[PDB]
Amino acid sequence: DKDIDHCMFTFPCLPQGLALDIGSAGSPHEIFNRCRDGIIPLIASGYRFYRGDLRYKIVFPSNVNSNIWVQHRPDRRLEGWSAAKIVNCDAVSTGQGVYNHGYASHIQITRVNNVIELEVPFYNATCYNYLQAFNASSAASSYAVSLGEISVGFQ
Amino acid sequence: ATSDDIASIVNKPVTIYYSIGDGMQFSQWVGYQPMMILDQLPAPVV
Amino acid sequence: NPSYQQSPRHFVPTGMHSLALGTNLVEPLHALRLDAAGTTQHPVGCAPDEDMTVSSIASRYGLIRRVQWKKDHAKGSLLLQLDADPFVEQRIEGTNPISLYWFAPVGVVSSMFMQWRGSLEYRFDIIASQFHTGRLIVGYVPGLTASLQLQMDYMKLKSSSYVVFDLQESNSFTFEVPYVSYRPWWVRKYGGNYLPSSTDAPSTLFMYVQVPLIPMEAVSDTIDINVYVRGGSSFEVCVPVQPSLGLNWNTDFILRNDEEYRAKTGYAPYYAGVWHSFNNSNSLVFRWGSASDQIAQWPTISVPRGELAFLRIKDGKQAAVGTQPWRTMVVWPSGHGYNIGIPTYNAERARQLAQHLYGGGSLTDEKAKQLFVPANQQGPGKVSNGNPVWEVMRAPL
Amino acid sequence: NPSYQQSPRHFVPTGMHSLALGTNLVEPLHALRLDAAGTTQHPVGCAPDEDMTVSSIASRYGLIRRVQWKKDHAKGSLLLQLDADPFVEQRIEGTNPISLYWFAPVGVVSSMFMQWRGSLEYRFDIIASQFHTGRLIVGYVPGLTASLQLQMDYMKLKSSSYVVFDLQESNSFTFEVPYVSYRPWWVRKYGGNYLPSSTDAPSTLFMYVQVPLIPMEAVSDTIDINVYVRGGSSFEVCVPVQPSLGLNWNTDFILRNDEEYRAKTGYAPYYAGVWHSFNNSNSLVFRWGSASDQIAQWPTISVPRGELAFLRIKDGKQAAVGTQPWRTMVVWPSGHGYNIGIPTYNAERARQLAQHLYGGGSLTDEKAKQLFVPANQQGPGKVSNGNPVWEVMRAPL
Amino acid sequence: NPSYQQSPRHFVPTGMHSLALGTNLVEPLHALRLDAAGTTQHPVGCAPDEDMTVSSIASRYGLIRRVQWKKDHAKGSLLLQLDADPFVEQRIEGTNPISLYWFAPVGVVSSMFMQWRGSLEYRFDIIASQFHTGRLIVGYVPGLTASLQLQMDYMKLKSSSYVVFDLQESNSFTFEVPYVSYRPWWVRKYGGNYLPSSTDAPSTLFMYVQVPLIPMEAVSDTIDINVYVRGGSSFEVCVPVQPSLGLNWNTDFILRNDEEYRAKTGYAPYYAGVWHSFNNSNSLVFRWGSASDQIAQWPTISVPRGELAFLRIKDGKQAAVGTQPWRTMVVWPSGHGYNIGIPTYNAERARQLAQHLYGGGSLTDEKAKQLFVPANQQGPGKVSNGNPVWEVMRAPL
Amino acid sequence: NPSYQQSPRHFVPTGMHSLALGTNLVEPLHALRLDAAGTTQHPVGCAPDEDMTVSSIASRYGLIRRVQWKKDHAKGSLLLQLDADPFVEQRIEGTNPISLYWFAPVGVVSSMFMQWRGSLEYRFDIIASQFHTGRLIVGYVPGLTASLQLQMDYMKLKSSSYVVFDLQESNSFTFEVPYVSYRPWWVRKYGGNYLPSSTDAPSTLFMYVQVPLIPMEAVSDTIDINVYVRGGSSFEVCVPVQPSLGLNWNTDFILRNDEEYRAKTGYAPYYAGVWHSFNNSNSLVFRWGSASDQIAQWPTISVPRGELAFLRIKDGKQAAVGTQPWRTMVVWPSGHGYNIGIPTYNAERARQLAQHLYGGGSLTDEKAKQLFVPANQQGPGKVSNGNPVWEVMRAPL
C-alpha cells in the first residue's frame, strides 16, 4: 500500500542497454523477444569504455492523471549484470524506496503532458565507465558502470 | 494500450491525410487514363 | 537564477496546422528523417525534366474526336458540334454500368478547378492524300443555350465567328476557339457528384462542310478528320475544388438503396454473445465489442400495423459464427433506446418470436424467453465479415 | 501596467520532441544536472581516442573464413564462394537452438543500415612457409542468382573479373571486391525478423586453385588460408533501420504457440477473490486488481460441440495462493462480454462444472453454484507469478 | 486587421520548470511581490558578511577528538586511528535510541555531496605546560582495508608517510593529511539510509607516541590532546545527493513493523457510518469520507486455516466515536475486492462474527447480520484520530 | 512550404496572469474596447487634479480629538494621552452593535499597510480669545508599555522629549511627533479580523497643562482644543495587506453561531421532491437541483443518547413550497454517507418518525414509510428562499 513518497520503480541508467528482458514465457515483451536488443546497445557492443550523458523521455500511461517524480541517484552502484533491470520496489526498508532530498529530481504533471524528458549526467569518480556486460570483479568496479540509478514514482 | 484499455479504441475512426511535401518532383509525362465523370454517378433512389 | 516576474504571452491553442494553405508558408513537421537539415535531393541524372504546371499540361493535345467525312456529304452537312469548353468528350463503348470517358489533358487538368477562361485550340488533322480536295467551315457561336443548339446550319454559323479551310495540299489546321462570355471566368461544366451547380458551356463549336469533298476515282471516298484539343496560349484556371473526374483504377461503386437491412454504421463487425441487461445474460444478442454495454444497434424496421418481420442474411458465409452460423434474427427495442438484434435457431423460431413481440408480447415474457438462444451456444464467437446485408422477411400477423 | 491588447500567437501543441531527428537540431531537456550551462567534459587523459564513425568501423578486418588447402586439390577445386556483400558469415557450432554467427565488423555495422554500396576488401593470408608454392584465382562474378550459383568452375570465372595470385615468398594479398549492380545502393541481405524484403547478394566471390599447391616433402601437405573482410575505401551505407542482428548477451527466445492457454495480456498477475456481479460475492473468481470490476479476462477455449474443457496449470508453484493453490479452473463467459475464470477445488469439481456449463446449464443454476468455491477460501490472496501457462484438459461430454 | 495566415509555432508543453537546475538559468515565477522589478535589498548595516561556499565552511576547525595522554604510555602506544575522510566522528553518550554524533564542519558540509577529494588538516593542540616534553608520530597509511586496520604499530607506520613532532615549548601543530587514492574523487563513507553504496575511508590516520611523555614531578602526569579537523586548501566536493546526516531538531523515528494492524494509507481518518452496498445501509462500516463509495479499505489479516481473528485498538481514545467508542472490529472482504472493517459492540460479538465468517458463513447470512451494529448507533460520527493501530486478537476456531 | 523540422520551444502553461504584481509589468488583456490601440483619455477640462499617493493623503489633517480645557484644571491635569501611531481614534456614540470610528486620513491610508515609520504631526488649535492665557506641555514618551501608560504625570514627562507652549496671542501650534523605536518600520496596531499580530503603539503622546489657564472675567472659563493628525514629512509605509478598516456603507454583520441548524453550504436553495434511491421515489426529500442524485446534505444533529430531535423552521415564509409550506423535517442518514432531510406534514408526524429512527427503526420500515410524505404532494416545487435557519426541536425518547 504505497504512500505519496514511495518510488513506483527504479532502474539503473546505462548506454550498454538494460539486460534484455524477453519477459516470462507466457507473456513475452514481443519487441525484445523479436526485435532483439537494438541499435545503441549493438554499437555499445563495439567499444569497451564510455564517458557521457544520456537522455530518456519516459512515456507514462495516459489514463492516469497523477503527478510523477523522477529521482536521479548517482550514488548507487550497479551490482552485477543481474539486477541491471527495471525493478518494482516493494515495502520501504531503506532509503531506496522513497523520494530523497539532495538527489537531483524532476516532477512531470501528467495532466499537462505525460512524457517527462531527461538528461542523465555523468557523475562518477572515474576516467570512464565500463561498457560491455558487467560481472563486477572489483567491489569498486561497481561504481564504474551505471551513470546513476533513476527512480520514477507516482504521488 | 494494454488490452484492458484497448476496448475503448475499437471502431474509433482514424482518418489520414497526405500531400507531396515540397521536395516532390514528378517526371515523365504520360497521358491520362480514361476518366469517369462524377456528376453522372447513380442516385441512391428513394 | 534571476527570477522572471513579468507577464507571460497569452496565446490561443489550435490543434492543427492549416490544410488548405500551400504556398508562402513554412510548415513545421515531426520529420521521420534522421538529419534535421536534410532534404531530398536530385542527382544530376535524376533531375526532374517536367515542370508540373497547369499550363504545361494544358498545352498538350490529346485526340478528342474522330469525325468521318464521306464524299456524299452535301454542302450543309454537320460533322460535329462539340461544346467550346475544355470538357470535350469521347465516351468509351464499355460494358461497365458506369461508362468511362476520354478527356483531353486540358479536360482533366481543368476538372480540378472551379473556373476557367481563355482560348482553346482545336487542331484538325484532315487525313487525306494531296489528291483529295474540299473545304469546311469551323465556326464558333457565342451564347448558344441548348434549345438553340438545334436550328443551326452552316449559314447561320457564318453570321458569327468562323474559319473556312481548304483541304488540298496542306491537310491540317488549328482553329483557335475564342473566349466569349459575360463572365470573366467560367464555371465548371460538371462538378463533384452534385448536379445543380453544373453550368453548361459558354458557346459552341461547329464544323460544317462548306464545299463537299471531291476525291479522284483512284483514292478513297472517305476522309478521316481528327479533332485534337489543347489549352490555348491564354487558357487559365483559378479556384481549386473537387475534381469532377475519377480514375478508372477502380470503377466499383455502391448504391445506398435502403431496401436491404443492416446494422448501424460503426456497430459492425458483430458477433453473438451474452449481455447482462438482457435476459440476465442467459440468452444471446449481437455485440460489436468485448467490453460491457457494447451491443450492436439496429435500424427500426418499418412494419405496417397488423404485420411482422424477421431477418435472414443474404449470405450464410458472412453471418457471425456461433455453434451454428446465425442466419436468423429478430430486431426488437432493448428498452435502452436502441434496437437490439436477437439471433435465433431458424426462420421458424424467428417467426414465432416475431408473432409474439408484435403480438403485444414483451422480452420479459416466458413465451419469448423460451425462444431466445441460450448462452452456451455462443461458441468461438467469431465476428461477422464486415457489416453483412440482411434480407427482411415479412409475414402477416 | 500598460495593457497588451494585441492578438496572441496561435500555436499548435504537440506532446513530444522528435525521436527520429538527431543532428542539426537543438533538443531541449529537463536536465538533472545542477548547473544549467554544465556539460560533460573530458580531462586530458580521459580523451576519446576513437572517432566513432561507420567508416572507422568498416575499415577493420575481422577473420571471416578459414579455408583449408590440401596438396591433393586438383586445379579445378573450389575453396569458397562467399557472397560479395558485407554479411559474410561464419556459424559457430553451438548447442543453442538459435545458433550464433560471427561477423566482420563491416558485417555488423552494415546490418544497422538498409542499404550499402562500394567495394569490399578480402585480405587473404595464405599461411605457408616460403618453400610452399602454388597459385589461385580469386574471382568475382556480377549478377549470379542462386540457381546460377552452381554450374560455376574456375574457367567460367575467368570470363569475368578475377585475380590470379602466386604463393611463393610473399604469402598474402588483398583482393578488392568491385561493386557491380544496377542499383546505386544495395538493400540488406537479411532484415528485422521478416523474411520478405531480404534481397540476396549482388554478386559472388570465388576462389579456385589455379595451380595446385606443390609442397616439399619436409613441409606440410596442407596450407591454411584466412579470409578477412574489410569495408573498402568506398564502402558506405545510408538508411538506418532495425539491425538484423542481436547480441549474444541473451539468447533466450519465446515461441508464441497458441496451444497453451493463458490469461489475456494486461490482465495478469491475478489472484482468487470476490466480485459482486458474480454469485453476489459468495464465490471466488480471478482478479487482476483490488479495485471493483477488475476481473481477469480469459481467451475463449475452442470447444467442438459435444465436448468440454477445464484448465490445469502446468506448474502448481505459479498458481495464485488461496487457502490452497488454485491449479484448477473453469472458464465461462461472465455475461459482461468477457470470459471469467472460476477457480475450483480439484479436477473433479472442475469437470463437473464443465459438464454443467456445456450441458445447457448456467452460472445462476443451483447445481453450478454448489460447485463454486466459497469466498472464505480466499486466504492471503497472493498474486500468481506472472501470467502462468494453463494446460487445457479436455473431455467428452 | 491584416490576417496572419502563416503557420504557428509547434511547441511541446511541460507542466513544470526544472527542479534540479540552479545556476545559469532564469527561472520565471508568479511573484507575490507588488512591484515586478522589485528584489530584496540589503541596507548597508544589514550586509551579508558571510560568503556561503563549500570552502568557506570546510575551512573551519571543529573539535573532533580529545585524546588523553598519560605519562605511563610506553613508546608503542596508540592514541587514535581515526579515518582519513572528512566524516571523522565523536559520538555523544546520549540516552536516545538513535545516538547523535558531533561532526567537523567539513564532516557535515561534505555529507551533502557524493564525492570528495584533496587534503584534510588535523590540527593537534597538545595541551601542556612548557615543562612537559615528549614526541609523537602522526602517520598516514594509504590503502588500509579494515582487516589491515589492525596489525598496525608505529614502526609499520614509519614505512609510509608520517610526521614526528616534539612537544616542548611550542605545543601545537597541524598535520596535513594527503589524498592518496586510485580514484580521482572519493565516494561518501555513509549515505542516505541505504547501507550498500557506503564505501569505507581511503586511508587511515594514526598517532602513536614516538617518545613517551616526561613530566616534572610538579606538573601533571597527563596531557590532553585536541584533534581538530579542517578542510584543507585543496579539499573539494562535487556531486550533490542526499545528506547522510539529519538535524537533531527532531530525533523521533518510526519503525514500520508489520505486526500491528492498521487501515491502508490514504483511507484514514475514518469514522463509523452507513453504506448502501453493505446490508442495505442498515449496519455500520468505517468510512474515510462523506461521499458515497468511500469505505476505508483494510489489509488482509494473515489467518492460518482453522483459526480466526478480530481487531482491538491499543488506545480507546483514538477510536472513531459513535454512540460508544469503537474499539472492536471484524475485517472481512466486501466482495468489491477490498476488505471492509465492521465495527462491533464488544470483543464477544466480534469473536462470534469471526467464528461465523471463518466458519463458512457470509455477510448476507442472518446469523451474521444480527451481529452487525445497526445504523442508529452512528452518533456524531467523529473521525478516528489519525490512523490508529489495531492489535490483532486471535483465537482458535 | 519549406518544412520546419527543428525542435519546438518547451514552455510551461499557467492558467492566469499574476494578481499580486502591479507595476513594471505589461499585463495582456482581452479588451472590450473596439480599437486595439485605444486608451482612455482626459480632455483638458477633465484633467486629474489629484495625484493619488500615500504621501498626498497622509499630508492632510483630519480632526481627531477635541479636548475641553476648563479654568479649574490644576497644573497637573491630563488632557489626552493618545498613542503615537497613525491609528489615533475618535469613536462615534452610535446605536450600532458595531460602533464606527473616525480616523485621520493618515489613519486610514496607513491601515492598508502592514508597516509604518517616521514622524506624525499633531496640530493643536487652542481656540481662545487673545485675552486667554495659559501654558501646556505636549510631551512624547518612547517605549511605554500599557502597564506604564499609567503612573504618568507631567513631571515624569519632562524627563523625555516634550514641548511647552504659551497660549497668549498666537493660539495654535503643531507638535511634530518623533519616531523612536528599535524597529526600522513599525507594525500595524490593528489587523484583519485576527487579534494576535496586533502590536500596540511605539510610544505615547501626552498633553498636560503646564500652567493653568487664566481667563478674564468677561471671557469664557473654558477653552476648546482641537487635535489634528497629519502624516509628517517623513511618514511612510511599506507592505500592503488587508485593511484593518471597513467602510460604513454597510455595517451589517453575521455571527456564525452553531446553535441554529441549516443545510450545508452549496446545497441550498432546496425544494421538496422525489428521489429514486429513497423509498423508490414514493416519498419526498429535499433537493438542491433537478438532476438526479442531487439531494441536499444536512449537518448531523448532536443528539445525546435517550433523546430525539426534529426540525422546525423559524420562518414559514422561507420554507420550500409544496402543496403546503414545509416547516417540519426529520434529518436522517441516507445510507449514502450523507444526512438527508425528510419533510413532514407537521410537528407531530415529525416527532413520531423521530421516535422511530432513534427507536432502533430504519427508513425501510413500514411504520416509518407511512410517515413519509407521498410524492403527489410535491406541488410547484418552489425553492426555499436562500438557506433558511432551522430551529432544532428536541424531545426525550
UniProtKB/TrEMBL annotation, chain A:
Designated name of the protein: Genome polyprotein
Subcellular location: Virion
Boundaries of the shown chain within the full protein: 954 to 1108 of 2893
TrEMBL record, chains C, D, E, F:
Annotated compartments: Virion
Name the UniProt record assigns to this protein: Genome polyprotein
Organism: Deformed wing virus
First-to-last residue of the parent protein present: 487 to 883 of 2893
